[PDB]
Amino acid sequence: CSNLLLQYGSFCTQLNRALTGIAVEQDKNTQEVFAQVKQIYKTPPIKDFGGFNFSQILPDPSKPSKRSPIEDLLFNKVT
Amino acid sequence: AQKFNGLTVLPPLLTDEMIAQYTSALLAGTITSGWTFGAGPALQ
Amino acid sequence: LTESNKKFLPFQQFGRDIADTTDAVRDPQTLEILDITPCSFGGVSVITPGTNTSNQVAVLYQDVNCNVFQTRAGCLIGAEHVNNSYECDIPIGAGICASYQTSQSIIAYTMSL
Amino acid sequence: LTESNKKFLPFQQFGRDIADTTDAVRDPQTLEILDITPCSFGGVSVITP
Amino acid sequence: QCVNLTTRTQLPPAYTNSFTRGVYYPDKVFRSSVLHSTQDLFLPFFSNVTWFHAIHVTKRFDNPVLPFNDGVYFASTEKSNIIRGWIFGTTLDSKTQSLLIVNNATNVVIKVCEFQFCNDPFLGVYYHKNNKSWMESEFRVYSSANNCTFEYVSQPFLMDLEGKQGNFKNLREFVFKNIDGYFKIYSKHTPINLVRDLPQGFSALEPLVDLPIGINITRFQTLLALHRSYLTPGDSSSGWTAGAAAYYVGYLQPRTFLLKYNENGTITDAVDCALDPLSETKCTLKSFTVEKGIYQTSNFRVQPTESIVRFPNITNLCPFGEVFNATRFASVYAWNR
Amino acid sequence: LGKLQDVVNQNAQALNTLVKQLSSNFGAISSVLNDILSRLDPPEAEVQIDRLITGRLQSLQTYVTQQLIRAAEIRASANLAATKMSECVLGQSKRVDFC
Amino acid sequence: RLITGRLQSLQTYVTQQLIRAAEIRASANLAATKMSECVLGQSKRVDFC
Numbered sequence: 001c002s003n004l005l006l007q008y009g010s011f012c013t014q015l016n017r018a019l020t021g022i023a024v025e026q027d028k029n030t031q032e033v034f035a036q037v038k039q040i041y042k043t044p045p046i047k048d049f050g051g052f053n054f055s056q057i058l059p060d061p062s063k064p065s066k067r068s069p070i071e072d073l074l075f076n077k078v079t
Numbered sequence: 080a081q082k083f084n085g086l087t088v089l090p091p092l093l094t095d096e097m098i099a100q101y102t103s104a105l106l107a108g109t110i111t112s113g114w115t116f117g118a119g120p121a122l123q
Numbered sequence: 124l125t126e127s128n129k130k131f132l133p134f135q136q137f138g139r140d141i142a143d144t145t146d147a148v149r150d151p152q153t154l155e156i157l158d159i160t161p162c163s164f165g166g167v168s169v170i171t172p173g174t175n176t177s178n179q180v181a182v183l184y185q186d187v188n189c190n191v192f193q194t195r196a197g198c199l200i201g202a203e204h205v206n207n208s209y210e211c212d213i214p215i216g217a218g219i220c221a222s223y224q225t226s227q228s229i230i231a232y233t234m235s236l
Numbered sequence: 237l238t239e240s241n242k243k244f245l246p247f248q249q250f251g252r253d254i255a256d257t258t259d260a261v262r263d264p265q266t267l268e269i270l271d272i273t274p275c276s277f278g279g280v281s282v283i284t285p
Numbered sequence: 286q287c288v289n290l291t292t293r294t295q296l297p298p299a300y301t302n303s304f305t306r307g308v309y310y311p312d313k314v315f316r317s318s319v320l321h322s323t324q325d326l327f328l329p330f331f332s333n334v335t336w337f338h339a340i341h342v343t344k345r346f347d348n349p350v351l352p353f354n355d356g357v358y359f360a361s362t363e364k365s366n367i368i369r370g371w372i373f374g375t376t377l378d379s380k381t382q383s384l385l386i387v388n389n390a391t392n393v394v395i396k397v398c399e400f401q402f403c404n405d406p407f408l409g410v411y412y413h414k415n416n417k418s419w420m421e422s423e424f425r426v427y428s429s430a431n432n433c434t435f436e437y438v439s440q441p442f443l444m445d446l447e448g449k450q451g452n453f454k455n456l457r458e459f460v461f462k463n464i465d466g467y468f469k470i471y472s473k474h475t476p477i478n479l480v481r482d483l484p485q486g487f488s489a490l491e492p493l494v495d496l497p498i499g500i501n502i503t504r505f506q507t508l509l510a511l512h513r514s515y516l517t518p519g520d521s522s523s524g525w526t527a528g529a530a531a532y533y534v535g536y537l538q539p540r541t542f543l544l545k546y547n548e549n550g551t552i553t554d555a556v557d558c559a560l561d562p563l564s565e566t567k568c569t570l571k572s573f574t575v576e577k578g579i580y581q582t583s584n585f586r587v588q589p590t591e592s593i594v595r596f597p598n599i600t601n602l603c604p605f606g607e608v609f610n611a612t613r614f615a616s617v618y619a620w621n622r
Numbered sequence: 623l624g625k626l627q628d629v630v631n632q633n634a635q636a637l638n639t640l641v642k643q644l645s646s647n648f649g650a651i652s653s654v655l656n657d658i659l660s661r662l663d664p665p666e667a668e669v670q671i672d673r674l675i676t677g678r679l680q681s682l683q684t685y686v687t688q689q690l691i692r693a694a695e696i697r698a699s700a701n702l703a704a705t706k707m708s709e710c711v712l713g714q715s716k717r718v719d720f721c
Numbered sequence: 722r723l724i725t726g727r728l729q730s731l732q733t734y735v736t737q738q739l740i741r742a743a744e745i746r747a748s749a750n751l752a753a754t755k756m757s758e759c760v761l762g763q764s765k766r767v768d769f770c
C-alpha cells in the first residue's frame with residue numbers, strides 16, 4: 001500500500017499541510033479573543049461595590065476550579 | 080423551470096409579500112419614531 | 124402526453140428544449156404534437172411536534188401535487204389548515220408553518236410577522 | 237489484551253463498538269474477557285531553539 | 286405403524302394479532318448501549334398470525350401440514366406440557382431427508398432421516414390403573430428409515446405427562462430458520478398469567494443450537510398427545526380426550542429493525558422502518574428521541590403503468606406480390622433466386 | 623447552547639463517517655486490504671488495490687475540503703468575537719444593536 | 722465508469738455551492754451590521770453608510 005502511495009504522497013503532503021494549517025489557525029484563534037490584556041488583575045478582598053452583586057460572575061474560592069458558578073453551569077450544559 | 084433528473088427547487092419560507100411587509104414596517108418605524116423602536120418601545 | 128399548442132414544421136419528428144431534452148415528439152399516424160413530461164418525484168418530509176408532547180406526525184411532499192390541504196409548498200396531509208395566524212416555530216416554506224395547537228392536533232397556518 | 241471488568245452473556249464470542257470494532261474478545265478456554273487496543277502510534281516532533 | 290382417524294366435527298381456525306413478539310438475537314456478538322440496525326428475518330409488529338386450537342372441550346384436533354417459508358415463528362402458552370415436538374420435510378414419503386424433533390420424557394434427540402411418516406403422527410399417553418401416573422407408550426411417528434447423515438442428542442429436559450384444564454402459567458416461543466443449510470433454533474421460557482391476547486411485553490429470544498443439516502424444508506407438522514383414561518373406551522375412533530392446550534404458528538419475512546442495547550448487552554426495544562412514519566423517523570436518525578423540526582426519511586416516485594408503441598404511418602410492405610403473381614416461371618434446373 | 627453542540631456533533635458525525643467509509647468496498651470485492659492480499663496475488667489484485675487506494679483518497683479530500691470550510695466560519699466567528707471583545711467589553715460601543 | 726464520472730461531477734458542484742454559501746453569508750452578515758447601524762439608528766462610522 002505504501003509502495004503505491006509513493007505516487008500519492010504529494011497529495012498526502014497537501015492534506016497534511018492543510019491539517020497543520022487549520023491547527024495552527026485554531027490555537028491562534030484563541031489568542032485574539034481572550035489574550036487582549038498582558039496584565040492579570042485581581043478583585044479587592046472586600047466586595048463593596050455600592051450594591052452591585054458580583055459573586056455570580058466572579059470566581060469563587062470555595063471550589064478548586066477557577067471557573068465561575070455560571071461557568072461551571074455552562075460547562076455542564078454542553079457535552 | 081427545473082423538472083429533470085434529480086433536481087428540485089425548494090420554495091423559501093419568506094416570499095416577496097412578507098419581506099416587503101417587513102421593509103414597510105421598518106420604514107414606518109424610522110419615520111414616526113426615529114431610533115427608539117430599534118432600541119426598545121416606539122417613542123412618538 | 125399532453126396536448127400542446129405549438130405547431131411543428133411538416134418535416135420534423137422530434138423536438139428539444141433549452142435544456143437539450145426531448146420533450147416534444149410528433150405522433151406519425153394522425154399528426155398531433157404531444158409533449159413529454161416526467162410523471163412525479165419528490166421526497167417524504169415529516170413534521171414532529173417533539174418529544175413528551177405528542178405522538179402523531181404528518182407527511183409533507185416537496186413538489187408533488189395532490190386532513191389534506193393543498194399548500195403552496197407541495198402537498199401536506201394529516202394537518203388541518205386554519206385561517207387564523209399565530210407565531211410559528213416549525214418552518215415549512217412559502218409563507219406557511221405548522222404547530223401543535225388545540226383535543227389538540229397538528230395544524231398548519233400562515234405565520235404572523 | 238487487558239483484563240476487562242465487563243461480563244459477557246454466555247452465547248457470544250466477540251464484542252464491537254459504535255465503530256463496530258472488535259475491541260472485545262472472549263477466551264475460548266477458561267472464560268475471560270479481554271479487550272483489544274491498538275499498540276502505539278504517533279509522530280516525532282522536533283523543538284528547535 | 287400408524288392408524289387413520291375418523292371424520293368428526295372440528296372448529297375452523299381463527300386469526301389473532303401479535304403484540305411485539307418474534308424478536309431474537311440476530312448475531313453472536315456483544316453490543317452495549319448501541320442502537321444497531323441489521324437486515325434479518327423477523328416477525329413484523331402487529332402482523333396477522335395464524336392461530337390453532339388444541340382444547341378438547343368439541344373434540345378439536347387440527348394439525349395440518351403447513352408450508353415452511355423463510356423462517357417461522359412458533360409460540361405456545363403451554364401449561365400441562367401437552368405439546369411434544371415438531372417434524373419437517375418436503376414430501377414425507379421416504380424420498381428426501383426429513384427432520385424429527387421430539388422432546389421425550391427422558392431425553393431430547395434430533396434425528397434427521399427419511400422416516401416414513403403417516404398422515405398424522407402423534408403420541409399416545411395411557412393412565413395406569415395400579416400406578417397413578419401418566420406414561421407414553423404409543424410411539425407412532427414413523428415406520429422405518431433407510432439411511433441418513435446427521436443425528437444429535439440434546440439435554441435431558443424433564444417433562445410432565447399430566448394434562449389439566451386450568452389456566453396457562455408458562456409461555457414458550459420457538460423460531461426455526463434455514464439460511465445456508467444452517468438450522469437455527471431460538472427459544473426462551475417466559476412465565477405469564479394469561480390465557481388469550483398475549484401481552485405487549487418484550488423478551489428477546491436467545492439462540493439455543495446451530496445444528497448443521499443442509500437439506501430442503503418446505504413442509505412441517507405438529508405433534509400432539511392425547512389421553513386414554515377409564516372414561517373413554519380406549520379406541521382412537523370416536524372417543525378420546527386431549528386436555529387443554531393451544532399453540533400459535535407464524536411466518537417470518539425479511540425486515541429492517543433498529544435494536545436497542547443496554548449496559549448488560551440485552552435487547553430492550555425494537556423500532557421498524559417500514560411500519561410507521563414516526564418509526565421511520567426514529568430509525569433514520571439512529572435515536573429513540575425525536576425533537577421538533579423538519580426531517581427527511583425517504584423519497585417518493587411514480588412507476589409507469591402501460592407501454593404504448595404508436596409506430597409510424599409510413600410502415601412499408603415487402604414485394605411478396607409479383608413473386609407470386611408472376612406470368613413467367615423458370616425451369617427447375619434454372620430456378621430463380 | 624445550540625452552536626457548540628451543533629459543531630461538536632458535526633465533528634463527530636463527519637469523523638464517524640470516515641471510519642464507516644473505511645468499511646466500504648468502493649465497487650471492489652472486499653473492503654479491508656489484508657483480505658485481498660491474503661486471498662489474491664499482488665500481481666493480479668493490483669487493480670483491486672489501486673481502486674481501494676483510489677476510493678479512500680477522495681474520502682480524505684472530501685473530509686479535508688469539509689474541514690477546510692469548517693475552519694472558515696470558525697475563523698469568521700472568532701473574528702466577530704474578537705471585534706465584539708474589542709468593542710462591547712473593552713469600552714462602550716456607540717454602535718446601536720451591535721452589543 | 723459512468724458512475725465514477727458522475728460522482729466526480731456532483732462533488733465539484735457541491736464544493737462550488739458551499740463556497741457561494743460562505744460568500745453570501747459574509748455579505749448577509751454585512752447587510753445585518755450595516756442596517757443595524759445605518760437604518761436602526763445613526764451610525765458614527767465615517768464612510769460606512
Ligand SMILES: *[C@@H]1O[C@H](CO)[C@@H](O[C@@H]2O[C@H](CO)[C@@H](O)[C@H](O)[C@H]2NC(C)=O)[C@H](O)[C@H]1NC(C)=O
Nearest residue numbers: 047048049051052053054055056057060069070
Ligand atoms: C449575590 O447573589 C447570590 C445568589 O447566588 C447570593 O447568594 C445566596 O444568598 C442567600 C442568602 O443567604 C443564600 O440563601 C443562598 O444560598 C445563596 N446562594 C448561593 C448560590 O450562594 C448572595 O447572597 C448575593 N450577595 C449579595 C451581596 O447580595
Ligand SMILES: *[C@@H]1O[C@H](CO)[C@@H](O[C@@H]2O[C@H](CO)[C@@H](O)[C@H](O)[C@H]2NC(C)=O)[C@H](O)[C@H]1NC(C)=O
Nearest residue numbers: 601602603604605606607608609610611612613
Ligand atoms: C395475386 O393477385 C390476386 C388477384 O388480384 C390477389 O388476390 C386479391 O388480393 C387482395 C389483397 O387485399 C384481396 O383484397 C382480393 O380480394 C384478392 N382477390 C382474389 C380474387 O383473391 C393476390 O393477393 C395476389 N397475390 C399476392 C401475393 O398479393
Ligand SMILES: *[C@@H]1O[C@H](CO)[C@@H](O)[C@H](O)[C@H]1NC(C)=O
Nearest residue numbers: 150151152153154597598599
Ligand atoms: C394513416 O394511414 C391510414 C390508412 O392506413 C389513414 O386512414 C390515415 O388517414 C393515415 N394518417 C395520416 C396520413 O396522418
Ligand SMILES: *[C@@H]1O[C@H](CO)[C@@H](O)[C@H](O)[C@H]1NC(C)=O
Nearest residue numbers: 186187188189193194195197
Ligand atoms: C393539482 O391537480 C389537480 C387535479 O389533478 C388540479 O386541479 C390542480 O390545478 C393541480 N394543481 C396545480 C398547482 O397544478
Ligand SMILES: *[C@@H]1O[C@H](CO)[C@@H](O)[C@H](O)[C@H]1NC(C)=O
Nearest residue numbers: 192203204205206207208231
Ligand atoms: C377563515 O375566515 C374567513 C373569513 O371570511 C373565511 O372566509 C374562511 O373560510 C375561514 N377559513 C376556515 C378554514 O374556516
Ligand SMILES: *[C@@H]1O[C@H](CO)[C@@H](O)[C@H](O)[C@H]1NC(C)=O
Nearest residue numbers: 246262263264265266267268
Ligand atoms: C477446555 O479444556 C481445558 C482442558 O481440559 C479446560 O482447562 C477448559 O476449562 C475447558 N474449557 C471449557 C470446558 O469451556
Ligand SMILES: *[C@@H]1O[C@H](CO)[C@@H](O)[C@H](O)[C@H]1NC(C)=O
Nearest residue numbers: 300301302303331332333334
Ligand atoms: C387477519 O386476516 C383476516 C382474514 O384474512 C382478517 O379478517 C383480519 O382482519 C386480519 N387481521 C388484521 C389485524 O388485519
Ligand SMILES: *[C@@H]1O[C@H](CO)[C@@H](O)[C@H](O)[C@H]1NC(C)=O
Nearest residue numbers: 387388389390391392394396
Ligand atoms: C423418547 O423418544 C426418542 C425419539 O426417538 C427415542 O429415541 C427415545 O428412545 C425415547 N425414550 C424412551 C425412554 O423410549
Ligand SMILES: *[C@@H]1O[C@H](CO)[C@@H](O)[C@H](O)[C@H]1NC(C)=O
Nearest residue numbers: 380381382399431432433434
Ligand atoms: C445415503 O447417504 C448418503 C451419504 O453418505 C447420501 O448421499 C444418500 O443420498 C443417502 N441415500 C439416500 C437414498 O438418500
Ligand SMILES: *[C@@H]1O[C@H](CO)[C@@H](O)[C@H](O)[C@H]1NC(C)=O
Nearest residue numbers: 375381382499500501502503
Ligand atoms: C433445494 O431446493 C432448492 C429449491 O427448491 C433447489 O434449488 C436446490 O437444488 C435443492 N437442493 C437439494 C440438495 O435438494
Ligand SMILES: *[C@@H]1O[C@H](CO)[C@@H](O)[C@H](O)[C@H]1NC(C)=O
Nearest residue numbers: 242243244547548549550551
Ligand atoms: C445490568 O447492569 C446494571 C447496571 O448497574 C446492573 O444493576 C445489573 O445488575 C446488571 N444485570 C446483570 C444481570 O448483571
